[PDB]
Design a protein around this nucleic acid. Structure first.
Lengths: 77, 53, 225, 50
RNA sequence: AGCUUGACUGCGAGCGUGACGGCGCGAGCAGGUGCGAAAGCAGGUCAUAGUGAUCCGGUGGUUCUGAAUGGAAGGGCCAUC
RNA sequence: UUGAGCCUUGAUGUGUAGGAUAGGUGGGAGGCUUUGAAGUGUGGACGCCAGUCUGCAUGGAGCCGACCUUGAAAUACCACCCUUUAAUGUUUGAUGUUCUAACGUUGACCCGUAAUCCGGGUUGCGGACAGUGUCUGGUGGGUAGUUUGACUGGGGCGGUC
RNA sequence: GUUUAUUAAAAACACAGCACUGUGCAAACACGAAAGUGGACGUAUACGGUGUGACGCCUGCCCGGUGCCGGAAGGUUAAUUGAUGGGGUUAGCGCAAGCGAAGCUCUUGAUCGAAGCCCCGGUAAACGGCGGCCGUAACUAUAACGGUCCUAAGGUAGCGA
RNA sequence: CCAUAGGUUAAUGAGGCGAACCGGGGGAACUGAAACAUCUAAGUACCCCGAGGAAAAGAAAUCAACCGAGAUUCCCCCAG
RNA sequence: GCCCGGAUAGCUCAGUCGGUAGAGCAGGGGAUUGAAAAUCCCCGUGUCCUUGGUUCGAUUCCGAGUCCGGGCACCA
C-alpha cells in the first residue's frame, strides 16, 4: 500500500471541483519514494518507502530516531 | 541547510565550517558518506569543543 | 571621446548618487572650468506621453534671481500698444505694417512677443521663428494684451519650458557664477513649476529622474523633492 | 443601441447626479444644464457627458 | 422667432383600470427656479407603442448598522450601471 | 556559451536645394591644440565598398559659426535620451556536454535456496535525466451524467410567442 | 465455410491475397488506481490496427474544411513569481480640519511564462470532394477548345436505364 | 571478518461467530428542485475494520463581554 | 470585455523606421510581323475605414471609435 512508513501519510480522498463546481471523487496519492537510508549504528542500507515530507522528518530527528519509532509500533524494516 | 563539514571537500573546504548547502548535496553525498553533518545545534557545539580543545 | 578638462570634473561627481538640491548647487559650481560664465541647466524625464495633447508640459516661470543674462526682446504691437511696449523696456518695437523689415536684416533678438490683435500678421511667414522657438504663442506667455507686463517678466528672468516630443524638458536657470544658495532657489523655482504643470491624466511618477549640468560640464543626479 | 447612456453629475461638492442618454455620434460636446439638487436644495450646474 | 430649462425635489385628498404584480390620471399644497408688464404657465414632446421582474455585483452619497471597545470591511437606504 | 531587460562606457542615423553617409529638442560666437593640433601615411572596424571614426606614428602650431542656401545648422564643445548596434558588468532565464553518490536496471555473478518469484550484496551500463506526485493549459464520446420548449384544426415542416 | 439457438443461412460475415500505417523491446496495445500479467518466454520475412477482398487488366484529378506528420520570425497566453499604486489600523505631530513612520493586513496584478491556436511546408490505399453559367469547330446538333464562377480541382480508362 | 537476513524449538496471544448500540476508513442512486448539472437526496443505504458494556468524547490556546461562567456527554428552550 | 492584425483605385493585392502611393485584371489605342497570333508599352475615375494629436507634411506613428479576421476571458 502506498502509505508512508514514517509520517503515516496515505492516499486521501477528495473531489475535482471544476469551474462549474462539478463534484467528482478523487484522491491525493502521497509522493512516496523508496529511498535507501544508511544507519551508522547498524551498518546497513535500510530502504524505506516514505514521502517527500517524510524524508525531511528523518533529517531533523534522525534515521536512528525514526526507526526507533517503527520497531515500537510493530513496523518492520 | 547549514550543516558542518568533516572532510575537506571542494568549493567549501575548511575541514570544519557552516555553509548554506542545498539539502540535496548534503542529504545524498556529504552526510551519507562522511563529509558533512546536520547542524542540529547539538553538533555545532560538539565539534566546537574540538576547535578549542 | 572627452578631454581631461572634462575627465577631471567627472571624478568630482558620483554617477551612482542622487545628490540634494543643496549639495548639487555647490558641486555644480565646480563643474564649470570653461573660459566663460557657463549657464545652469536642469533636465528631467517626465513620466508622461509626449505624444498626447492632453499631456503636454508647456508654459513660463519667473526665476527669483533671474537668469543672469541680457535678453533682447522684440515686440510687435499695434496702436497705443506700441508706446506701452517701448516704455516697457523692449529693445526693439516694430509696427504691424513693418513686420517684413525685421525678416530682412533686422533680425537680432532672443525672444519675441506680440499682441492677440496682431497674430494674423506675425503668424504667417513664421517659418523663421517657429523652428527657432521665437514664434509667439498664448501658451508660452508671449501673446497677451498686457505686453507691458509680459516683457518685464522676460527682462526680469522669466524662462519658458516645453517638453519635447520624446518626454524630456530642459531650461536655463541662471549661470554658474551665482552663489550656491542662489542657484538652489532658482532650481526649486522650476521644480515646483513642472509639478504645477503636471497633466491630470499623467500616470506613474511624474518626476522619474532629475539632473543638473553646466555648459561645458557633466550632469548630476538630484532629488527634486 | 447606438444612443449611449450618460449621467449628469453635480458641479457642486455633492455626489448627486441625474441619469439620461445622448447622441455621441453628432453630439460629442459636453452636455451642461441647470437642474434641481435634492442635497443642496438649489439648482446647480450639471455637466459630465459621454 | 426671442428669452431659457418644470425632462425639478418631497407629497398628493380623490379617482380610473386589473386576480395579483403593475400601470394610468390628478387639481392642489410646501421648498427651490425659468419665462412674461401682468393675469398665469411649466412635474418633457398632441395623446396612445419606443420595453426587461428577481437574484447576484460594481460606483457615488448617507456614521443608519459597526458580531468585545474605538474604526474599518461588509450590509441596508437613495441615485445609478 | 548565449538569448533578452537593466547601468555606465563607445558607435549610430546616405527626403531635396548643397562646402556633406544633417537624430530631435536645449545650453551655446567660441572652445580645442604646446597636459604637443591640422594635414598626410597604415592597422582594427561599421557599412547602402558613399563615407566616416580611432589607437599608434610621421608632422608640427592650426582647425572654426549666421555665412548666399535648408521646413530645421553643426565633427566648434557639452547634457537629458530615442532609433540602431557592439563590448565589460549586473540581473532574470535558456542550451548542451562531462562526472557519480540517489533513482532505474525484464545485463552478469553470489547467497538465502538442487527455486524462471522476491529480497540483500557485488559489478557493469545509464544518470539527477527517465519516471512519479501536485498544480496548470491544451487535448479527450474511450467513458459518464443530461438537455435538446410549447402552442399547433394529429404531429412534423413553415410560422408564431 | 460462418451467422440472427426458437419466422431472416442471404448479395451479409469470414476468406487466403494485397495495401497503408504504428511498433527497436521494459515494444505498440490491452486487462488493472498499483503491483503484476498478457502480448511473447516472440524480435520488423515479428506483431497490432485499418481497408479491401481468389485471380486477370489497373487503381486517375484535388490538400481549402476536418485530421495526421514536421518546422517556426512575430503575436496572444495558465499555474508560479509578486514589481507599483490605493485602502484599513496607529506611535507621534496638530488646541481642530487633517495628515500620518514602522509593523501587520486587505486589495490591485508589471515582470518571468511552455504548449496550444493562428501561421507555414507535406500527406488522400485518411474523413471526403470530383459541379454550375456562357462563347466556339464555315448545313444542323454537339463541344476537341477557350473564359468565368475563387469553393481545391471539376471526370482518365472502363462501364452505364 | 564482525554483524544481519534466514532456519529450528518453546511460551503466550491472536483467528471465529453474533440482533442492536458506537468510533473510524470508503462512500451512491433513485428522488426533490414538477426538466436539469450548482444544490437536495446524504454523510443516509450499503461495503469494510476495531472495541466495549457502553462506546465515543472529555479537564479549555472554550465561551462571555468589562459583570462572569468554568471538562465532556445527554434532555428541554433559545428558534424554525 | 482585453489584445494583435487587416480595411489601399471598380475588383484581387504588393509597399515605407516618419514625404511625387505602384502592379495585375478590363477597355480603347499604339508599337512590333508582310498579315492574323502572341509579346511590350501608353492612357487612371484615391480625402489609402472614420474623427483628432505631433509635424513644413499623415495610408504610415500615437489616442479614441467602427466594420471585419483570430484567440482568450466571460457565474446576474
Amino acid at each position: 500500500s502506498r502509505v508512508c512508513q514514517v509520517t503515516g501519510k496515505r492516499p486521501v480522498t477528495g473531489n475535482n471541483r471544476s469551474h462549474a463546481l462539478n463534484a467528482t471523487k478523487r484522491r491525493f496519492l502521497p509522493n512516496l519514494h523508496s529511498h535507501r537510508f544508511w544507519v551508522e549504528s547498524e551498518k546497513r542500507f535500510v530502504t524505506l518507502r516514505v514521502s517527500a515530507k517524510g524524508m525531511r522528518v528523518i533529517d531533523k530527528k534522525g534515521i536512528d530516531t525514526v526507526l526507533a519509532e517503527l520497531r515500537a509500533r510493530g513496523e518492520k524494516y | 541547510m547549514q550543516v558542518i563539514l568533516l572532510d575537506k571537500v571542494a568549493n567549501l573546504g575548511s575541514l570544519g565550517d557552516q555553509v548554506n548547502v542545498k539539502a540535496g548535496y548534503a542529504r545524498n553525498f556529504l552526510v551519507p558518506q562522511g563529509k558533512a553533518v546536520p547542524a542540529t545545534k547539538k553538533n555545532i557545539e560538539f565539534f566546537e569543543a574540538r576547535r578549542a580543545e | 571621446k572627452l578631454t581631461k578638462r572634462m575627465r577631471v570634473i567627472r571624478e568630482k561627481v558620483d554617477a551612482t548618487k542622487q545628490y540634494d538640491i543643496n549639495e548639487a548647487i555647490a558641486l555644480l559650481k565646480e563643474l564649470a572650468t570653461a573660459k566663460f560664465v557657463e549657464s545652469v541647466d536642469v533636465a528631467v524625464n517626465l513620466g508622461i506621453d509626449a505624444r498626447k495633447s492632453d499631456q503636454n508640459v508647456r508654459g513660463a516661470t519667473v526665476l527669483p534671481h533671474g537668469t543672469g543674462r541680457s535678453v533682447r526682446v522684440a515686440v510687435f504691437t499695434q496702436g497705443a500698444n506700441a508706446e506701452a511696449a517701448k516704455a516697457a523696456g523692449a529693445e526693439l518695437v516694430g509696427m504691424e505694417d513693418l513686420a517684413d523689415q525685421i525678416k530682412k536684416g533686422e533680425m537680432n533678438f532672443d525672444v519675441v512677443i506680440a499682441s492677440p490683435d496682431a497674430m494674423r500678421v506675425v503668424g504667417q511667414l513664421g517659418q523663421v521663428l517657429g523652428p527657432r522657438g521665437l514664434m509667439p504663442n498664448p501658451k508660452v506667455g508671449t501673446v497677451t494684451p498686457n505686453v507691458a507686463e509680459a516683457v518685464k517678466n522676460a527682462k526680469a528672468g522669466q524662462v519658458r519650458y516645453r517638453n519635447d516630443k520624446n518626454g524630456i524638458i530642459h531650461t536655463t536657470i541662471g549661470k554658474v557664477d551665482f552663489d550656491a544658495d542662489k542657484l538652489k532657489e532658482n532650481l526649486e523655482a522650476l521644480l515646483v513649476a513642472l509639478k504645477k504643470a503636471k497633466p491630470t491624466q499623467a500616470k506613474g511618477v511624474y518626476i522619474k529622474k532629475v539632473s543638473i549640468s553646466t555648459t561645458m560640464g557633466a550632469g548630476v543626479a538630484v532629488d527634486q523633492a | 443601441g447606438i444612443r449611449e447612456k450618460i449621467k449628469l453629475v453635480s458641479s457642486a461638492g455633492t455626489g448627486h447626479f441625474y441619469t439620461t442618454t445622448k447622441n455621441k455620434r453628432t453630439k460629442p460636446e459636453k452636455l451642461e444644464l441647470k437642474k434641481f439638487d435634492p442635497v443642496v436644495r438649489q439648482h446647480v450646474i450639471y455637466k459630465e457627458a459621454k
